[PDB]
Scaffold this active site. Structure first.
Site, PDB file in Angstrom:
ATOM      1  CG  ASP A   1      -1.888  -1.152   1.232  1.00 57.06           C
ATOM      2  OD1 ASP A   1      -2.367  -1.540   0.147  1.00 57.06           O
ATOM      3  OD2 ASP A   1      -2.166  -1.683   2.326  1.00 57.06           O
TER       4      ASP A   1
ATOM      5  CB  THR B   1      -2.759   2.043  -4.162  1.00 59.43           C
ATOM      6  OG1 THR B   1      -2.046   1.917  -5.398  1.00 59.43           O
ATOM      7  CG2 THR B   1      -4.055   1.199  -4.245  1.00 59.43           C
TER       8      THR B   1
HETATM    9  N1  LIG Z   1     -10.342 -10.153  -7.147  1.00 59.33           N
HETATM   10  C1  LIG Z   1     -10.416  -8.966  -7.797  1.00 59.33           C
HETATM   11  N2  LIG Z   1     -10.875  -8.893  -9.066  1.00 59.33           N
HETATM   12  C2  LIG Z   1     -10.958  -7.725  -9.732  1.00 59.33           C
HETATM   13  N3  LIG Z   1     -10.594  -6.547  -9.193  1.00 59.33           N
HETATM   14  C3  LIG Z   1     -10.114  -6.469  -7.928  1.00 59.33           C
HETATM   15  C4  LIG Z   1      -9.997  -7.704  -7.142  1.00 59.33           C
HETATM   16  N4  LIG Z   1      -9.504  -7.348  -5.942  1.00 59.33           N
HETATM   17  C5  LIG Z   1      -9.318  -6.003  -5.952  1.00 59.33           C
HETATM   18  N5  LIG Z   1      -9.683  -5.481  -7.139  1.00 59.33           N
HETATM   19  C6  LIG Z   1      -9.620  -4.044  -7.510  1.00 59.33           C
HETATM   20  O1  LIG Z   1      -8.470  -3.412  -6.938  1.00 59.33           O
HETATM   21  C7  LIG Z   1      -8.798  -2.075  -6.546  1.00 59.33           C
HETATM   22  C8  LIG Z   1      -7.997  -1.638  -5.324  1.00 59.33           C
HETATM   23  O2  LIG Z   1      -7.737  -2.758  -4.477  1.00 59.33           O
HETATM   24  P1  LIG Z   1      -7.246  -2.580  -2.952  1.00 59.33           P
HETATM   25  O3  LIG Z   1      -7.683  -3.794  -2.169  1.00 59.33           O
HETATM   26  O4  LIG Z   1      -7.601  -1.193  -2.469  1.00 59.33           O
HETATM   27  O5  LIG Z   1      -5.645  -2.633  -3.113  1.00 59.33           O
HETATM   28  P2  LIG Z   1      -4.678  -2.209  -1.898  1.00 59.33           P
HETATM   29  O6  LIG Z   1      -5.033  -3.175  -0.793  1.00 59.33           O
HETATM   30  O7  LIG Z   1      -3.290  -2.390  -2.464  1.00 59.33           O
HETATM   31  O8  LIG Z   1      -5.045  -0.772  -1.610  1.00 59.33           O
HETATM   32  C9  LIG Z   1     -10.301  -2.057  -6.302  1.00 59.33           C
HETATM   33  O9  LIG Z   1     -10.881  -0.868  -6.848  1.00 59.33           O
HETATM   34  C10 LIG Z   1     -10.840  -3.305  -6.979  1.00 59.33           C
HETATM   35  O10 LIG Z   1     -11.739  -2.971  -8.043  1.00 59.33           O
END
Ligand SMILES: Nc1ncnc2c1ncn2[C@@H]1O[C@H](COP(=O)(O)OP(=O)(O)O)[C@@H](O)[C@H]1O
Ligand SMILES: [Mg+2]
Lengths: 546, 48, 49, 48, 40, 77, 51
Positions: free
Chosen positions: A63, A97
């Site tokens: 992150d 992010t």
């Molecule tokens: N399994 C998945 N399939 C498709 N898109 C995903 C999936 N997991 C997360 N995303 C996309 O990733 C984006 C940001 O994910 P996030 O969990 O915030 O990442 P981080 O934990 O690095 O901040 C979200 O807007 C979501 O649409």
């Protein structure tokens, strides 16, 4: 960019002077320079990074919250994105992010509008009318989370927060863990409003078996060592009393500025005895109360340890302030800063003691932890994370800590929306028809605002090392028919996104990925308020330090 | 709100072990009767 | 074996520029856009020198 | 000694909310109704 | 920049540039500095 | 685009007028700086050969395609 | 203990001369040294190759 400008030509400033579109270009490259490290960390296909402190120490982080905080940037335009990453971690706790990438592209895509002689006041106005139109469309397309009879509105929510982490493969096991943890530590306030205090659960840095075999504690786990080794480690039997003290229990001197003076040397030993006796009178009444386990914020001297070893009491020193409030809240006790009452006498009542079913001290890889389970008044929970080393667990600690904030919001607000860039692609089709209605110069501002929102689903395909235009063109085709759905459910071609592990467009409801709508609301406003801050700057005045 | 002392520095002596019991009780008694007057005046919020 | 150091053999010479990654071709485009900015306002009769 | 009830004010609600990390103490309403009241407004924002 | 030495013209750090309104004020005041010599 | 920005005119009003007026402005439709308006260039007697246009596109297409087929940079010493 | 003997009988040859035997994974390093410029050739074979 090309060359340095003239230094104070007939202006007489001690520092540097620059103006025109050169600094506006430097702000774009500044926001893009800090955003490139955030690009590769987006989505499940993103990879982690490591930051070295030039002392051997390193930390793995995915992150962009703590990455940009550690990266000491000197350009002030980049500091706003650094603070934006820290701001989004406080309120929402997820999407740090995404705001950096969204805010950078809004400035990058608006850079073309600057040299078109469109004023920034007209550009932000076109962005703002697109914003409130986007928020209402988000308020139309979202959904409540009681949703269905089965839960799995909480098992699926954890997968979105758990994606793009080292333990994303183990999210099926940890999904049941986080939902069982936050449902145990709920509280009551404001006459019916339920709250979920984040960080109340104890995240322990253990080493051992694996992240898959991480046992969920049905109760709070205190991370502290035992005072003496001759004490009993395991205390069985029901109704174990918990005493939470904070007063100074070791032998201390007299008042902060007084001097002991005595003429008769006969009573010199007696005053020494009562100073040693007055501290043991407090320990005498705790034994009369019968507290099996006692916890103290301050130290514990050896004069007190002999009484606990004899009476088989578990005395633990070096507790912290924030922990003992949760022990007293969970076990049912009350925080005791000092032993007194409204009357002049000094005594201790049994009502101050808590209750729990079992207390066991466990050690795993040089980590002594007191496992307190079976709180009668209110439940508690703790998660014992297990991995390779402490620096790998810091990513897991941030992964779990962000998961609690996401599951907090879906229970506080039942409305959710699907992931995979669905709403980011849906707003483009909604704003293109709205851009033609308004007519005048704001059409390009609303149009380029919509084009900047597509960067979220595009980055998922670029980092996947696959063909991106085919997935974006197919996602564009389904969302294009959603506005022209022709209602009479048969309202299909909506709530779809990218599936990166297979490379197809499928239904995100069945795939099991969701995100709360409030995260989309605050991220868009905070990203646009940061975009307003950078666009309105014209000339820089850097004063050198004296 | 503190134990009883003037603004300047002072010296308190102890010639007998029984004097400490009166000192520790009277120091909180000066805090106690202030809380009684606060309770008599039913003042629920204080700004120091 | 002839020395306690055993230096690791670098492929290229010392001082050679960096290589593949993200932003190599983009720097060449930005380098051309930089030179293109200087010749930008000189277009047409109402331009400059 | 001069502490009494006549010198104290009154209010309906005095609380301290924690609105997404930003901790603030807020008072609601004044029943004294003096001659010239005062104005208090908190400024919130994304950036300092 | 992206960390690499972003240089285009030879002797990048030596030469400077000037544009906008400040380039014009350097021109007119330079003529006034010469005009004061010739005016008297 | 830049030919009108140097003239001080707004580019949006110009570029919107060029696209929607090519039907009657079949081929000789372009910008006019004197009257601060857009009209037919055949009446204004402004001419230019075609060889500048062919060599410009061929040289520009060859220039962009040269380094677009490059993803490396080696600099000895 | 504070310092090694730094490879005795090293004055047989000059200080600048170095030996590189098959052991110590050095043949793997020579394969890795080929792998540095070999990957440059991957982007340059074929009709879609990059200059
Ligand atoms: N399994 C998945 N399939 C498709 N898109 C995903 C999936 N997991 C997360 N995303 C996309 O990733 C984006 C940001 O994910 P996030 O969990 O915030 O990442 P981080 O934990 O690095 O901040 C979200 O807007 C979501 O649409
Ligand atoms: Mg997340």
């Amino acid at each position: 960019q090309l060359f340095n400008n003239s230094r104070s030509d007939t202006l007489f400033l001690g520092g540097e002077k620059i103006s025109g579109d050169d600094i506006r270009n430097q702000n774009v490259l500044a926001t893009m320079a800090v955003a490139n490290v955030v690009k590769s960390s987006l989505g499940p296909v993103g990879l982690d990074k490591m930051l070295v402190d030039d002392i051997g120490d390193f930390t793995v982080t995915n992150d962009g919250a703590t990455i940009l905080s550690l990266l000491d940037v000197q350009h002030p335009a980049g500091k706003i994105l650094v603070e934006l990453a820290q701001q989004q971690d406080r309120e929402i706790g997820d999407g740090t992010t995404s705001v950096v990438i969204i805010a950078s592209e809004l400035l990058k895509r608006a850079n073309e509008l600057v040299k078109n002689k469109i004023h920034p006041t007209t550009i932000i106005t076109g962005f703002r009318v697109a914003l409130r139109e986007a928020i209402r469309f988000i308020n139309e397309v979202l959904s409540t989370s009681v949703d269905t009879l089965g839960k799995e509105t909480l098992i699926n929510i954890a997968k979105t927060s758990m994606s793009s982490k080292i333990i994303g493969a183990d999210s099926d096991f940890f999904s049941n863990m986080v939902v069982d943890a936050l449902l145990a530590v709920k509280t009551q306030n404001s006459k019916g409003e339920i709250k979920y205090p984040v960080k109340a659960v104890n995240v322990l840095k253990a080493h051992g078996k694996s992240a898959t075999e991480s046992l969920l504690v049905p109760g709070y786990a205190l991370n502290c060592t035992v005072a003496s080794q001759a004490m009993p480690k395991r205390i069985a039997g029901g109704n174990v009393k918990i005493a939470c003290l904070d007063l100074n229990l070791q032998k201390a001197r007299m008042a902060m500025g007084v001097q002991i003076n005595i003429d008769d040397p006969e009573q010199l030993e007696q005053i020494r005895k009562r100073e040693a006796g007055i501290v043991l009178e407090r320990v005498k009444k705790i034994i009369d109360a019968g507290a099996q386990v006692v916890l103290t914020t301050k130290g514990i001297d050896d004069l007190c340890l002999k009484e606990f070893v004899e009476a088989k009491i578990m005395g633990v020193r070096r507790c912290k302030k924030e922990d003992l409030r949760r022990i007293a809240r969970a076990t049912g006790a009350t925080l005791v800063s000092s032993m007194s009452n409204l009357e002049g006498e000094e005594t201790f009542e049994s009502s101050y003691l808590g209750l729990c079913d079992e207390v066991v001290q466990a050690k795993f890889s040089d980590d002594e932890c007191i496992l307190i389970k079976g709180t009668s008044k209110h439940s508690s929970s703790s998660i014992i994370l297990r991995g390779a080393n402490d620096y790998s667990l810091d990513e897991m600690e941030r992964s779990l800590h962000d998961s609690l904030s996401v599951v907090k919001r879906t229970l506080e607000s039942g409305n959710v929306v699907p992931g995979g860039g669905c709403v980011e692609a849906a707003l483009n089709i909604y704003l293109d028809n709205f851009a033609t209605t308004v007519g005048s110069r704001e059409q390009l501002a609303i149009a380029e605002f919509a084009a900047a929102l597509l960067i979220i689903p595009k980055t998922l395909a670029v980092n996947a090392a696959k063909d991106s235009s085919e997935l974006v063109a197919k996602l564009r085709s389904y969302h294009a028919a959603s506005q022209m759905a022709k209602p009479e459910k048969r309202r299909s071609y909506r709530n779809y996104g990218l599936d990166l592990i297979r490379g197809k467009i499928v239904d995100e409801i069945h795939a099991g990925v969701l995100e709360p709508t409030i995260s989309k609301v605050k991220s868009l406003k905070s990203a646009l308020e940061a975009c307003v801050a950078i666009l309105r700057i014209d000339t820089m005045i850097t004063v050198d330090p004296e | 709100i503190s134990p009883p002392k003037p603004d300047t520095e002072n010296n308190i002596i102890v010639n007998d072990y029984r004097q400490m019991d009166k000192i520790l009780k009277e120091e909180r008694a000066y805090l106690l009767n202030i809380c009684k007057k606060i309770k008599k005046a039913k003042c629920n919020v204080l700004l120091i | 074996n002839f020395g306690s150091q055993t230096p690791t053999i670098v492929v290229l010479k010392e001082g050679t520029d960096a290589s593949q990654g993200k932003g190599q071709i983009i720097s060449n485009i930005n380098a051309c856009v930089a030179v293109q900015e200087a010749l930008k306002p000189t277009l047409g009769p109402l331009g400059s020198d | 000694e001069l502490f009494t009830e006549d010198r104290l004010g009154s209010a309906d609600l005095v609380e301290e909310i924690d609105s997404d990390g930003s901790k603030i103490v807020r008072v609601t309403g004044i029943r004294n109704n003096n001659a010239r009241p005062t104005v208090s407004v908190v400024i919130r924002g994304a950036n300092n | 920049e992206m960390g690499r030495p972003f240089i285009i013209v030879k002797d990048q750090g030596n030469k400077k540039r000037q544009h906008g309104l400040e380039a014009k004020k350097s021109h007119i005041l330079a003529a006034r500095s010469v005009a004061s010599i010739i005016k008297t | 685009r830049q030919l009108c920005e140097n003239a001080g005119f707004d580019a949006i009003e110009i570029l919107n007028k060029l696209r929607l007026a090519h039907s009657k402005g079949e081929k000789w439709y372009g910008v006019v700086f004197e009257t601060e308006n857009i009209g037919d260039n055949f009446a204004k007697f402004v001419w230019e050969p075609a060889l500048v246009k062919i060599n410009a596109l061929n040289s520009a297409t060859e220039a962009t395609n040269l380094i677009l087929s490059v993803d490396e940079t080696i600099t000895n010493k | 203990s504070l310092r090694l003997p730094q490879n005795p009988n090293a004055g047989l040859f000059k200080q600048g001369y170095n030996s590189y035997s098959n052991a110590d994974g050095q043949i793997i390093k020579s394969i890795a040294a080929i792998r540095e410029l070999h990957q440059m050739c991957l982007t340059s074979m074929g009709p879609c190759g990059r200059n």
